[PDB]
Design a protein around this nucleic acid. Sequence first.
RNA 1: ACAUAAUCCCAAAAAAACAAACUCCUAGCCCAAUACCGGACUAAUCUAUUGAAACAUAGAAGCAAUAAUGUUAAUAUGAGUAACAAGAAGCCUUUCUCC
RNA 2: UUACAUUGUUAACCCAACACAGGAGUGCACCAAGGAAAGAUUAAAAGAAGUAAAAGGAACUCGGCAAACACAAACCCCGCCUG
RNA 3: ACUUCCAAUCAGUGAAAUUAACCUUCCCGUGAAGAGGCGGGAAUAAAAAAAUAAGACGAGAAGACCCUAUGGAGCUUUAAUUA
Lengths: 120, 123, 68, 272, 134
Amino acid sequence: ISHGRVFRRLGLGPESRIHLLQNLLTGLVRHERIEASWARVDELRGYAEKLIDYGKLGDTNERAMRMADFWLTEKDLIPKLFQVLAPRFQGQNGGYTRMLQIPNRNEQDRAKMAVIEYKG
Amino acid sequence: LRSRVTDRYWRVQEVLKHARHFRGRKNRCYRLAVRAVTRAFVKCTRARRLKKRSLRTLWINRITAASQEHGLKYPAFIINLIKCQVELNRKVLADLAIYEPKTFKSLAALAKRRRXXXXXXXX
Amino acid sequence: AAPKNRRSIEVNRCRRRNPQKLIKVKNNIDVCPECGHLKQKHILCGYCXXXXXXXXXXXXXXXXXXXX
Amino acid sequence: XXXXXXXXXXXXXXXXXXXXXXXXXXXXXXXXDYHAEIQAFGHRLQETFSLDLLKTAFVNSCYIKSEEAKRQKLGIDKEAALLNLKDNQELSEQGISFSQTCLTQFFEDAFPDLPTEGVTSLVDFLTSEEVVCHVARNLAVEQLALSAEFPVPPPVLRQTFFAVIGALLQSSGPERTALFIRDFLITQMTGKELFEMWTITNPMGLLVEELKKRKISAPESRLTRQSGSTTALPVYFVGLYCDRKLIAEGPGETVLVAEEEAARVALRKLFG
Amino acid sequence: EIYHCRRQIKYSKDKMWYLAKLIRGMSIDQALAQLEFSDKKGAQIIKEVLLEAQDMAVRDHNVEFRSNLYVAESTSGRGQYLKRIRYHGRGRFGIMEKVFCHYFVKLVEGXXXXXXXXXXXXXXXXXXXXXXXX
RNA sequence: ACAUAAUCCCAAAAAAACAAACUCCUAGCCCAAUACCGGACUAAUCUAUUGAAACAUAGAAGCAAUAAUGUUAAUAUGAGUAACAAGAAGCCUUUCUCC
RNA sequence: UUACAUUGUUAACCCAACACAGGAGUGCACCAAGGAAAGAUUAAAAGAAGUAAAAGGAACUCGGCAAACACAAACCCCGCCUG
RNA sequence: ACUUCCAAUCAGUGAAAUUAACCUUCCCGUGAAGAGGCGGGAAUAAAAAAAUAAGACGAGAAGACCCUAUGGAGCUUUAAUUA
Ligand SMILES: [Zn+2]
């Protein structure tokens, strides 16, 4: 039953779900803003906040280091995340990963479109 | 060599012309129109035969009512009318039982008079 | 299983019209605070935003091509 | 042949969505002549005289004006139909007057107990345009009527009818007319409407006037009983009397309507 | 009156009728907005038909005020059917019928007036008293 | 003493009338029917005659369709049902992810 | 004797009515070759495939069928056996 | 209890067998002896979707058992008749 359950499915397996989150977060941290389905976005929010917080923990700390290496394989994302994106959010707490809605829909599945963006 | 020409189409057109106001395919399709037409005519004959029965029963009910208003029943009124040599139909008798209570009151008075005179002559 | 008899027009109409309520019409229409164009409620405009998003995408591609 | 029946079915089906206006000249299939019509008109009715006045009776000013208009437009020749209308209007004038006198005589002889107001009302209703024109159309006078513009409109058939009246007045004299009109009008009335249009305003007060004029007694309304119904209509039994003697009694849904109907029945009761 | 028609276009008639009844009786503006933000295959098509109808209304009829235009009538007919072969199992072939829809739009000038309001008490008290007197 | 919800057709009641293709009255095309047999006619095609965009005098038939799990064609019902179709970010072309 | 010629390859794949989880001959790799479950939501019943389970351990059932774990031992009928 | 593919929703493309016409309730009786269409009582404003398979002697095969036809065919003989 769906009673009291976060962590949705979205028609993907656990590995496929995790990999999807890693890819969407890759694009998110790379382009600073991305466009995806409302469900995937709303789900991506929390994980994004988590990765940001992990970046806020410490650079030298091993826990944060191996966590960041675990989720993000790309070597381009990590230094840009720690050195650039992290220090500007230092004062913020829940103030990152904003979600907005897109006016139109796809011509195929008419999927509701939403955009996720970090505060500049 | 002959042809089907307009004959069949005209017959169908006629049947469907008589099939108007019918419900569904019976006012559209030809076969169901015919099947409904036969039943319609049979019911025409039968209902025209039983119409007299329905009207007769209704008239009998009305006259029974008007009679019971005066204290006597329908059969007694009929008998009294028979012995009064009254050949008046129940239609006109019902019409009088509705529009002209005076005449029916007179007939009922004569009815009770004949009944009382017969009951007094028998004793 | 198989249908016993052919469906009448009345049943078909009453089934395909009334319960489904066709398409319920609410008001999604709102005027954009910027360009004044008519757009959907609780949603970003499709005029003054998509062009700025395409210009921001071209500026991000030009910056990524100039940095490389 | 199938072509003639397909053409007949197509013409009969084309006449359903298209309705042509009625024409007076193409109305009758056979040739229409004056003498034929007046001959049949003489054979049907008892007596008919003054053929010229009879023909003039069915002539209207519109046809004359249209004819003269065509005469001026084309400019071919010139003829004078002028005398027809001038001779017709007089017959219509005398017709109206003598009709009023005759009907007044009728209401005077038939109902002597009828008050002046009732006489006026009944005369106004009997001489009404709609009723007389209805009698006209029912007698198929429109077929004998000649109108250039349109056959239908009432100002034509009515004036034509009155012209026929006056024509019968001059030609056949009063004795015949009194036979003709008196037969139709009465047969046409048949209703309670005769005294209903006179009852349209304050039925009670009118009864008061009549009673005060005749027996000089003020009418009194007294409720003799009440049988109530809350659902549809309540029934009140209302008596109406003068000098302790009950004139009438009747049921009603409301006191007002009950008094209205009681006053109406009492109104027709004193009519005799 | 301004008429506009579209034929030999392939879409589901029953589905297009949903958006066809949607704009029926409705004013030009509301119908435009609706069809714009309505989600279906008929939305775009009927939007095009409406736009063309408005263009024809302005250009051909030379209407002074565009606000005096509303949709009086809208209907969807059925055109020819394209028969295709749908392959099934066990060597059997079914017949897939590709349908067509002919969209017709009839526009009349003047302000749109539609009243669906009916008083229950008035209608009851009138119809009952008239039926009891007949 | 038998097996779904009661009363042996409703409800009740107590301890001379109503009522049929029968008979009569009124009118006229004067008194049913299955298989089968007999008589008299109508719709359609064509030919001779006549008439010419509507008909009758006869002759001649591939001559009157509601059915044969009929034939052919068109169009429905089932039904908007079954069925067909799980990567992503971008960007003008790459990156990440899966087998 | 000009045997300095003639054809074809290299085009895209094809048989089963179908752009069909089914089909076939030969040489060598298993990767630097190649394909992406290429419409989206919902996390009901129920079904298919798969995973895990307290205590009992065939009490199930025509039969340890199925199924996770394993295969220690017993006794017959028929046929020798490899086919 | 969980996972995945369907079922469910929306959008695109849009079947099939079946089908005399269907305004299609139940009980007690009857009717070729098992009635939603008959009778009498009981019940009931009008229309869908997701589900359960009792009924419409459901759909699907002109019973493969039985018997009939002076039917057919295979096989076997000391049936009879013989190149
Ligand atoms: Zn805008």
